[PDB]
Amino acid sequence: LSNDFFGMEDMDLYDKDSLRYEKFRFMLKMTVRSNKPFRSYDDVTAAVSQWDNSYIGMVGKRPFYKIIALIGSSHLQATPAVLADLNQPEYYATLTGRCFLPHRLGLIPPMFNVSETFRKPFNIGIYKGTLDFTFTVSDDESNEKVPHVWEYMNPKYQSQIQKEGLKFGLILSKKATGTWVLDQLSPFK
Amino acid sequence: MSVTVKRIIDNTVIVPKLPANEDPVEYPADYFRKSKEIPLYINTTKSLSDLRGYVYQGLKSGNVSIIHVNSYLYGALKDIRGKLDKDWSSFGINIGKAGDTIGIFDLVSLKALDGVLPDGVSDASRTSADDKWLPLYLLGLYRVGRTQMPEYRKKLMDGLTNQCKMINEQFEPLVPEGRDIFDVWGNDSNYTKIVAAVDMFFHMFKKHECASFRYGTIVSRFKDCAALATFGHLCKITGMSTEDVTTWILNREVADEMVQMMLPGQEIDKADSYMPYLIDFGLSSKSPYSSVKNPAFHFWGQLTALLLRSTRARNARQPDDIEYTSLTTAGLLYAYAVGSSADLAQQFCVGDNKYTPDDSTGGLTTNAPPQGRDVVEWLGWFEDQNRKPTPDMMQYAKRAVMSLQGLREKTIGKYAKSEFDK
Amino acid sequence: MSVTVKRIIDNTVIVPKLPANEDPVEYPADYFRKSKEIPLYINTTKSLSDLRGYVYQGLKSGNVSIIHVNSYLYGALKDIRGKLDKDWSSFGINIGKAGDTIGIFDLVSLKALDGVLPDGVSDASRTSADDKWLPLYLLGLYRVGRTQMPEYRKKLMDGLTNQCKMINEQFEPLVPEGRDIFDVWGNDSNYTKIVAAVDMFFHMFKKHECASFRYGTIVSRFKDCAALATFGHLCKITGMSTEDVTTWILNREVADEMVQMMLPGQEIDKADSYMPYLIDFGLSSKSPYSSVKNPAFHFWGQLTALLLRSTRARNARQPDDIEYTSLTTAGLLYAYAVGSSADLAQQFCVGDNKYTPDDSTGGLTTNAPPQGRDVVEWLGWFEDQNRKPTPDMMQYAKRAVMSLQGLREKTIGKYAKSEFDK
Amino acid sequence: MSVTVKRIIDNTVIVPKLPANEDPVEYPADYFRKSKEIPLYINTTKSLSDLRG
Amino acid sequence: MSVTVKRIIDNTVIVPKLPANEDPVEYPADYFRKSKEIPLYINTTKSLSDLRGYVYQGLKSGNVSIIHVNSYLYGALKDIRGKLDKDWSSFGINIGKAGDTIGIFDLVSLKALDGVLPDGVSDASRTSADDKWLPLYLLGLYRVGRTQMPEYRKKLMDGLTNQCKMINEQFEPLVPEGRDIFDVWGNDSNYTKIVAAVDMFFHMFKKHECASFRYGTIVSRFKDCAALATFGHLCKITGMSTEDVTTWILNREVADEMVQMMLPGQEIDKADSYMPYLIDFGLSSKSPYSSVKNPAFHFWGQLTALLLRSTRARNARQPDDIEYTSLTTAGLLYAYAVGSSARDVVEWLGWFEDQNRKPTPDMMQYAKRAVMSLQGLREKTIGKYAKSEFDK
RNA sequence: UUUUUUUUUUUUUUUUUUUUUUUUUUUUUUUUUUUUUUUUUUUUUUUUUUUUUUUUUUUUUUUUUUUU
């Protein structure tokens, strides 16, 4: 930073972290296979947080993809196969709608209506298995008001979204009004 | 329209247009532009064991429901195993990417069926030895229920029984001797989607440990694509390059048939594509490559291949309500061109030794076969023969159609023996 | 596209293309560019003695599992012995460095199989007498279960039993007389990988003490590569060098097969390479070098070698759905050229005495064979006959095909006797 | 490579090569360049009388 | 330009000028006037044994780096031995003075390369038996890779192996048989500078102990100077003086090529000079003495030598897209003059004008005799063209 | 006769070698010598198909019932 070398003055457009609202509609599909059922939602976040260990996908939607992964993990309802002993427990979750995310990550490049699938095995120790994803994050120029993005998680789960939302690499904060603004991802990531 | 049409009593236009007696062709590209996924509606609100008992007891009692068998086939074929080595993009759909394991249903979108689930004949004495042989039998009935004649259906059933016995080794037959119910399964859309997805998945992974399931679903490959299959067979039997063959087609309906047959954006040359399943996946309600929609080329190509002594082109059904004179003449001309005048030209050379002696009395104008394969030169010879085929062509056809014992009714062989064997 | 085709009613292009009736060719170079190893999935979570008991009692009871036999074959073939003398690099993989001891499975990547292990028929009375004959018998079953003919299968089983008694000399047969379960073993990918790795390891180490394992795995060498076998047989039966044989190919369809056959980055001339096992190792799912994918070249080579009185070119199966007239004419021409005009040319000179008498009545142009092996001389001679076979050529074919007793159906010998023995 | 063969449809070479159905020759000089000795592996941990018996 | 060219609609000048599709010639004198040294950039931040292992294992694995081989070649070729006897001044550079020890790289300026050094695959079990045969092999793999034809490459590899085996006697071949990587070495400039310096140093010191290094680097001598080589061949194969042969050239394009070849300040008649390596040392990027920048004279001289029964003038390839009829006529006139008159140019010009400029049947018969019975003529060469046209 | 405007079933622009890595050109070389098919449910059209195959070829090494 400026304490180290010479001449890294910030730009006049956004000072350091000029807050901005990015309205965007989205779609999501999820499929989590595991050897044993997830006892707690924390284990679910641990198993899904490494969905981008080798990342090929979008950069302008990478924070958006992380938040969509978080919302999918929040609503990861079980399946009849998850019962006592039928097969490996297979989870599923899908969400669609529109939302706006307050964030301090700078101006985002214009997003397009393109879908990208994601596949990656996870190893959180006790639990084995893989994942599945299908995001459809894109801009929404319509004036139509959209629900707040962090509202899409039910209060039933995520007793502390400050860390449950941080398990995926996000850094959260509070806007002193009850709305969570996304500070940035994991540092250098 | 092509150009304007004038009836000269008042200089007025008529602009004729064909009636919609038969539905127009539909291409897979149009469907994949409309939707970016292939929905599959199934009822998953049941356990795997309960569905297995349902389908087992229904097959044994001959009253199994289509919803139950579809749900059980989904439940027993969730084998994510099978590692892709290359990308499997098809029609702008990213199935996988060079290393990620995919399942059977990873290539078709999955939804929830909106309807009521039948009660069932649930059994609990059947263990979890179902994935080895039961999906095989259930998919085999799909292919079996298309012969519509016992002397072939019996052979197909025996083959399916042997296929399943090689895995299970007990396999008491489930469906009774009579009382068929698998004939209706073709009508259902979800069953066709599942069977075609299974066929394509096991076609991509030939060396899979469950590749035996290709039996009973191989009929889905290139289903209702008889025109494309006979075009390939013709290109392979004539030995001529596949692009020079299309220059030879005549009669003015084969050309337009070909144009609708190979619209560029259809991806008919890629094996691991969605095109061969354009009708089972629901990509097209009326396949443009079918024989009912493409009668003239199918007839002409089958006749030509028969005149070239091909064992395949002796059982294809002769299409109705088409010309049987112009197409037959064109096919006979093609057959006499390829089967008599062998090309037999120098192909590889070491620096030199390339050409042919053109100064050693290379006369051309004669009442002899052109001794070549160019379409224009044989056409010039034929029109010098005033479009009346020579008796030598009749002799060639007689030699190529005679000794064909055991012909099949309504097929190309019977017509050739009745026509070119006067 | 090689060239363009115009629809002449409005001058529009149609770009004809073949259907995907058969899978496209796949080359090992592409596979090794995609991945830098050959994965071998096995379940090694069992002791060697327990696995040996499993496989022994399964073979005796005829209900052995492929996973158990694969794991036991890995366990009993961990012979790191065998010292390389030269480098064994192949397809950009450093197998060894000229002096380091190497095992059978050091040339294929090893992974852990993900699945359920069958229970088994575990026995404890079997001592440590496994490596002597049990892997040999298990590998011999792989070759036995590919004949699909009772006589040849029985002969191969007798040979395998003799080979096993060579080392064990007790050897009560394990698999029962009926219930052929080893037929399915060829379908499994891991078993094919193991057997091909064993074959290549013991081909590199010919003088190894366990070289008897080459029985039953030699079929893996050059598996599904009948085109290269027939090309080598042709090049060895004529004496003509490959670089000059390849010029003689004709009919313009052998050309494409030859071109796709000889792409540079395959090192098909290297014995200690992965090319012979391009399909058993899983490098190529569709072998470009097969006979079904190369029917024209295979047929032409077999017919030509048959007309040159070769003991091999009399049982090769004649391909189907190919033009036979042009290929027969080309094969007859080449065979007559080889068997009528011996080269008989001075090769080595002691300083002087090289040339030939050209001024001593060097008559060349006449109704006689060119008395040489140049392709264009014979082409000009044949064109001087207006592209029809002379009766001397037919007489030569008759003498080269007559007295072929005990011919085999659907083979080249039967076809030649039906065609070149009028 | 002795001489080249070119395909007359597009002026393209093919570089044909024979298959390795029969293993290539190896010369003793090549081995003696690779190694300067002939290894003879035996087990001498036994007396002569025991081995002859 | 020479003289003005006018358009007669208004009497306006246009001064036509040829487009620069081919780069203009560059002369060694101009480069030496610009700079008084030949820089050689190498990376010397490695031990000699480390570089030896690097290059040895790179050659064995066929993935060697050009920087490593250049650095090792510098390290193993610091043989300051070799005592001069006469002054070796060239292009105004004091290389040595009549009795001082001189090294290979003493005649080229040395700098430090600015770049990242690759890793290297050094083998630490290699003794100090490198300078005996390894630099010779590394220099020979430049000429071997300059062939681009399997038969000539195979023959040169056999010759190089024979040359190397004379020294160490074991010499297991290093570069793998396939995937030849040494073709790229010619692209680099410092490797060419090193190989040319070695060639010139061992050309001055013919009787050196390490004179065997001349193999492989001999191709650098007179590189891309085929026009001067064929001029010398014409001057030698006829016995006619060099001052008199230059008058016989005609067609006014050979004259211009001679003019651009014979600049006085080029000292092209000095063996121990920088001229033969004008393109390897980087003195000139476009050699004026090449056969592509001087196609007309090269063709004419090769044809004339062919018609005078010379075994050399039957493999030189015919230059592309140049007027042949006038060049062939001039070559036939010169060849007939030499072969029938054991030589004045204007006398033969007048004799030909007595025929109003048409070859006589006697000259065609002489050409037929000079071109008949040429077995094994290779394609696109002067021999093939003469056999096609002069052997009707 | 005509709605007005029209007048290449001419055109994105820039192109004009199925020319081009540069350097080459002895496949010279160490040096030194109402209708009216007593038509049709739809999709069909090898009573073709698990895949891979194509020698009832193959332990490797052999090729004088030759030799101390």
mmCIF file of C-alpha atoms in Angstrom, chain E residues 172-376:
data_model
loop_
_atom_site.group_PDB
_atom_site.id
_atom_site.type_symbol
_atom_site.label_atom_id
_atom_site.label_comp_id
_atom_site.label_asym_id
_atom_site.label_seq_id
_atom_site.Cartn_x
_atom_site.Cartn_y
_atom_site.Cartn_z
ATOM 1 C CA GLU E 172 25.959 -42.601 -27.113
ATOM 2 C CA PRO E 173 23.837 -40.324 -29.355
ATOM 3 C CA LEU E 174 22.262 -37.545 -27.312
ATOM 4 C CA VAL E 175 19.420 -35.902 -29.258
ATOM 5 C CA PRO E 176 16.424 -38.257 -29.648
ATOM 6 C CA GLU E 177 15.823 -39.609 -33.137
ATOM 7 C CA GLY E 178 12.460 -37.851 -33.430
ATOM 8 C CA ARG E 179 11.236 -34.323 -32.646
ATOM 9 C CA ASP E 180 14.379 -32.492 -33.797
ATOM 10 C CA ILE E 181 14.673 -29.369 -31.634
ATOM 11 C CA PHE E 182 17.958 -28.020 -33.050
ATOM 12 C CA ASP E 183 16.250 -26.401 -36.055
ATOM 13 C CA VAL E 184 15.309 -23.442 -33.835
ATOM 14 C CA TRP E 185 18.961 -22.879 -32.852
ATOM 15 C CA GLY E 186 19.634 -21.212 -36.202
ATOM 16 C CA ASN E 187 16.918 -18.645 -35.488
ATOM 17 C CA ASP E 188 18.791 -17.320 -32.446
ATOM 18 C CA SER E 189 21.477 -14.706 -33.097
ATOM 19 C CA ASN E 190 24.017 -15.371 -30.332
ATOM 20 C CA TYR E 191 24.332 -19.051 -31.272
ATOM 21 C CA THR E 192 25.058 -18.045 -34.872
ATOM 22 C CA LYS E 193 27.608 -15.490 -33.655
ATOM 23 C CA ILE E 194 29.360 -18.142 -31.552
ATOM 24 C CA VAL E 195 29.375 -20.722 -34.349
ATOM 25 C CA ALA E 196 30.691 -18.199 -36.893
ATOM 26 C CA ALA E 197 33.407 -17.022 -34.498
ATOM 27 C CA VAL E 198 34.466 -20.639 -33.965
ATOM 28 C CA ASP E 199 34.512 -21.235 -37.722
ATOM 29 C CA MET E 200 36.648 -18.179 -38.467
ATOM 30 C CA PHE E 201 39.046 -18.827 -35.576
ATOM 31 C CA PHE E 202 39.639 -22.403 -36.707
ATOM 32 C CA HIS E 203 39.879 -21.264 -40.335
ATOM 33 C CA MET E 204 42.778 -18.990 -39.407
ATOM 34 C CA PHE E 205 44.270 -21.727 -37.186
ATOM 35 C CA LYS E 206 43.900 -24.750 -39.447
ATOM 36 C CA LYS E 207 46.477 -26.885 -37.597
ATOM 37 C CA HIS E 208 44.922 -26.431 -34.149
ATOM 38 C CA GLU E 209 44.356 -29.444 -31.910
ATOM 39 C CA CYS E 210 40.637 -28.608 -31.686
ATOM 40 C CA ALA E 211 40.347 -27.908 -35.429
ATOM 41 C CA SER E 212 37.803 -30.747 -35.625
ATOM 42 C CA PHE E 213 35.211 -28.227 -34.395
ATOM 43 C CA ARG E 214 35.117 -26.943 -37.988
ATOM 44 C CA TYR E 215 32.564 -29.685 -38.654
ATOM 45 C CA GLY E 216 29.063 -28.257 -38.462
ATOM 46 C CA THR E 217 30.354 -24.688 -38.377
ATOM 47 C CA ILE E 218 31.769 -24.875 -41.915
ATOM 48 C CA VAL E 219 28.238 -24.143 -43.168
ATOM 49 C CA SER E 220 28.541 -20.703 -41.542
ATOM 50 C CA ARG E 221 31.420 -19.812 -43.879
ATOM 51 C CA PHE E 222 30.104 -17.742 -46.804
ATOM 52 C CA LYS E 223 26.556 -18.228 -45.534
ATOM 53 C CA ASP E 224 23.931 -16.811 -47.920
ATOM 54 C CA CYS E 225 26.672 -15.768 -50.354
ATOM 55 C CA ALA E 226 25.804 -17.991 -53.312
ATOM 56 C CA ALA E 227 26.177 -15.197 -55.885
ATOM 57 C CA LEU E 228 29.826 -14.585 -54.984
ATOM 58 C CA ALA E 229 30.393 -18.347 -54.813
ATOM 59 C CA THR E 230 29.006 -18.839 -58.321
ATOM 60 C CA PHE E 231 31.040 -15.865 -59.567
ATOM 61 C CA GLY E 232 34.164 -17.580 -58.254
ATOM 62 C CA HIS E 233 33.022 -20.867 -59.779
ATOM 63 C CA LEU E 234 32.573 -19.171 -63.159
ATOM 64 C CA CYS E 235 35.988 -17.516 -62.875
ATOM 65 C CA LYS E 236 37.611 -20.876 -62.040
ATOM 66 C CA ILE E 237 35.766 -23.267 -64.396
ATOM 67 C CA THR E 238 36.626 -21.175 -67.472
ATOM 68 C CA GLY E 239 40.217 -20.169 -66.712
ATOM 69 C CA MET E 240 39.299 -16.667 -67.880
ATOM 70 C CA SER E 241 40.463 -13.731 -65.782
ATOM 71 C CA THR E 242 38.069 -12.180 -63.281
ATOM 72 C CA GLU E 243 38.763 -8.698 -64.679
ATOM 73 C CA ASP E 244 37.745 -9.902 -68.168
ATOM 74 C CA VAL E 245 34.719 -12.065 -67.327
ATOM 75 C CA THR E 246 32.910 -9.094 -65.763
ATOM 76 C CA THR E 247 32.761 -7.403 -69.181
ATOM 77 C CA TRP E 248 30.889 -10.370 -70.674
ATOM 78 C CA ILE E 249 27.815 -10.027 -68.441
ATOM 79 C CA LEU E 250 24.729 -8.605 -70.137
ATOM 80 C CA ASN E 251 20.945 -8.140 -69.739
ATOM 81 C CA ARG E 252 21.529 -5.025 -67.594
ATOM 82 C CA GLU E 253 20.198 -6.790 -64.495
ATOM 83 C CA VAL E 254 23.319 -8.910 -64.053
ATOM 84 C CA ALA E 255 25.195 -5.619 -64.468
ATOM 85 C CA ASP E 256 23.292 -4.036 -61.574
ATOM 86 C CA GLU E 257 23.770 -7.149 -59.435
ATOM 87 C CA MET E 258 27.516 -7.008 -60.127
ATOM 88 C CA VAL E 259 27.553 -3.300 -59.260
ATOM 89 C CA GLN E 260 25.857 -3.957 -55.920
ATOM 90 C CA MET E 261 28.154 -6.949 -55.330
ATOM 91 C CA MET E 262 31.454 -5.202 -56.127
ATOM 92 C CA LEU E 263 31.429 -2.208 -53.772
ATOM 93 C CA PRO E 264 35.158 -1.424 -53.285
ATOM 94 C CA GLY E 265 34.977 -0.984 -49.519
ATOM 95 C CA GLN E 266 33.811 -4.543 -48.845
ATOM 96 C CA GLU E 267 37.204 -6.361 -49.076
ATOM 97 C CA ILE E 268 35.521 -9.475 -50.502
ATOM 98 C CA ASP E 269 38.911 -10.878 -51.592
ATOM 99 C CA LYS E 270 40.298 -11.377 -48.065
ATOM 100 C CA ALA E 271 39.986 -14.853 -46.568
ATOM 101 C CA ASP E 272 40.708 -13.908 -42.936
ATOM 102 C CA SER E 273 38.004 -11.237 -42.672
ATOM 103 C CA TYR E 274 34.497 -10.786 -41.287
ATOM 104 C CA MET E 275 32.919 -10.835 -44.766
ATOM 105 C CA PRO E 276 31.948 -14.556 -44.994
ATOM 106 C CA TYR E 277 29.989 -14.239 -41.721
ATOM 107 C CA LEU E 278 28.191 -11.000 -42.609
ATOM 108 C CA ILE E 279 24.840 -12.548 -41.639
ATOM 109 C CA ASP E 280 25.803 -14.879 -38.757
ATOM 110 C CA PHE E 281 27.684 -12.169 -36.837
ATOM 111 C CA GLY E 282 24.698 -9.927 -37.505
ATOM 112 C CA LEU E 283 26.677 -7.523 -39.692
ATOM 113 C CA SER E 284 23.930 -7.588 -42.336
ATOM 114 C CA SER E 285 20.362 -8.856 -42.064
ATOM 115 C CA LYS E 286 20.033 -9.022 -45.876
ATOM 116 C CA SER E 287 23.212 -10.223 -47.575
ATOM 117 C CA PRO E 288 23.717 -8.563 -50.992
ATOM 118 C CA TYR E 289 25.660 -11.635 -52.176
ATOM 119 C CA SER E 290 22.741 -14.036 -51.654
ATOM 120 C CA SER E 291 21.114 -16.024 -54.456
ATOM 121 C CA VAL E 292 17.681 -14.496 -53.767
ATOM 122 C CA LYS E 293 18.788 -10.838 -53.925
ATOM 123 C CA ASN E 294 20.914 -11.627 -57.017
ATOM 124 C CA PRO E 295 18.782 -14.148 -58.923
ATOM 125 C CA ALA E 296 19.598 -13.085 -62.488
ATOM 126 C CA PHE E 297 23.382 -13.337 -62.194
ATOM 127 C CA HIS E 298 23.150 -16.548 -60.166
ATOM 128 C CA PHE E 299 20.959 -18.158 -62.831
ATOM 129 C CA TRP E 300 23.146 -16.921 -65.691
ATOM 130 C CA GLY E 301 26.399 -18.065 -64.095
ATOM 131 C CA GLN E 302 25.000 -21.447 -63.086
ATOM 132 C CA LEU E 303 23.672 -22.039 -66.609
ATOM 133 C CA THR E 304 26.963 -20.948 -68.187
ATOM 134 C CA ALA E 305 28.953 -23.266 -65.918
ATOM 135 C CA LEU E 306 26.521 -26.102 -66.681
ATOM 136 C CA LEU E 307 27.010 -25.630 -70.424
ATOM 137 C CA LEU E 308 30.787 -25.854 -69.827
ATOM 138 C CA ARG E 309 30.541 -29.386 -68.354
ATOM 139 C CA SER E 310 30.867 -28.630 -64.641
ATOM 140 C CA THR E 311 29.611 -31.161 -62.099
ATOM 141 C CA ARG E 312 28.761 -28.375 -59.628
ATOM 142 C CA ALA E 313 26.329 -26.502 -61.879
ATOM 143 C CA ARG E 314 23.696 -29.256 -61.961
ATOM 144 C CA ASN E 315 22.199 -28.970 -58.457
ATOM 145 C CA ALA E 316 21.779 -25.196 -58.014
ATOM 146 C CA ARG E 317 18.067 -24.411 -58.142
ATOM 147 C CA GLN E 318 16.549 -22.108 -60.736
ATOM 148 C CA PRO E 319 15.704 -18.633 -59.369
ATOM 149 C CA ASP E 320 12.028 -17.701 -59.409
ATOM 150 C CA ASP E 321 10.229 -15.052 -61.469
ATOM 151 C CA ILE E 322 13.101 -13.666 -63.556
ATOM 152 C CA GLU E 323 13.308 -13.242 -67.326
ATOM 153 C CA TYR E 324 15.083 -16.316 -68.686
ATOM 154 C CA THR E 325 15.267 -15.981 -72.483
ATOM 155 C CA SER E 326 17.819 -13.154 -72.541
ATOM 156 C CA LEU E 327 19.814 -14.689 -69.682
ATOM 157 C CA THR E 328 19.810 -18.071 -71.432
ATOM 158 C CA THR E 329 20.938 -16.446 -74.689
ATOM 159 C CA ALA E 330 23.819 -14.649 -72.959
ATOM 160 C CA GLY E 331 24.827 -17.807 -71.104
ATOM 161 C CA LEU E 332 24.760 -19.846 -74.309
ATOM 162 C CA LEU E 333 26.887 -17.222 -76.069
ATOM 163 C CA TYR E 334 29.484 -17.245 -73.277
ATOM 164 C CA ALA E 335 29.487 -21.045 -73.059
ATOM 165 C CA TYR E 336 29.938 -21.470 -76.810
ATOM 166 C CA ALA E 337 32.706 -18.854 -76.819
ATOM 167 C CA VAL E 338 34.597 -20.704 -74.081
ATOM 168 C CA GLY E 339 34.005 -24.229 -75.385
ATOM 169 C CA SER E 340 34.704 -23.482 -79.057
ATOM 170 C CA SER E 341 37.490 -20.870 -78.694
ATOM 171 C CA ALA E 342 40.331 -21.987 -76.446
ATOM 172 C CA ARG E 343 37.161 -14.842 -75.911
ATOM 173 C CA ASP E 344 36.538 -11.142 -76.609
ATOM 174 C CA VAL E 345 33.002 -10.031 -75.790
ATOM 175 C CA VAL E 346 32.309 -7.415 -78.482
ATOM 176 C CA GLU E 347 33.635 -9.726 -81.202
ATOM 177 C CA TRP E 348 31.123 -12.401 -80.195
ATOM 178 C CA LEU E 349 28.402 -9.759 -79.836
ATOM 179 C CA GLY E 350 29.022 -8.657 -83.421
ATOM 180 C CA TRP E 351 29.119 -12.281 -84.562
ATOM 181 C CA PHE E 352 25.722 -12.833 -82.925
ATOM 182 C CA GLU E 353 24.357 -9.612 -84.449
ATOM 183 C CA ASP E 354 25.376 -11.021 -87.835
ATOM 184 C CA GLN E 355 22.643 -13.562 -87.016
ATOM 185 C CA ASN E 356 20.373 -10.658 -85.915
ATOM 186 C CA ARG E 357 20.246 -12.148 -82.407
ATOM 187 C CA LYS E 358 19.051 -15.735 -82.794
ATOM 188 C CA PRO E 359 21.175 -18.764 -81.576
ATOM 189 C CA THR E 360 22.670 -20.786 -84.395
ATOM 190 C CA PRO E 361 21.909 -24.516 -84.726
ATOM 191 C CA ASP E 362 25.594 -25.196 -84.020
ATOM 192 C CA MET E 363 25.304 -23.486 -80.628
ATOM 193 C CA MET E 364 22.176 -25.519 -79.870
ATOM 194 C CA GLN E 365 24.104 -28.669 -80.822
ATOM 195 C CA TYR E 366 26.927 -27.650 -78.471
ATOM 196 C CA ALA E 367 24.413 -27.048 -75.677
ATOM 197 C CA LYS E 368 22.816 -30.427 -76.411
ATOM 198 C CA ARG E 369 26.223 -32.090 -76.089
ATOM 199 C CA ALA E 370 26.902 -30.201 -72.852
ATOM 200 C CA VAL E 371 23.524 -31.152 -71.325
ATOM 201 C CA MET E 372 22.922 -34.655 -72.704
ATOM 202 C CA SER E 373 23.638 -37.680 -70.495
ATOM 203 C CA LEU E 374 22.985 -35.970 -67.151
ATOM 204 C CA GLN E 375 21.527 -38.829 -65.125
ATOM 205 C CA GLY E 376 19.667 -38.163 -61.894
#
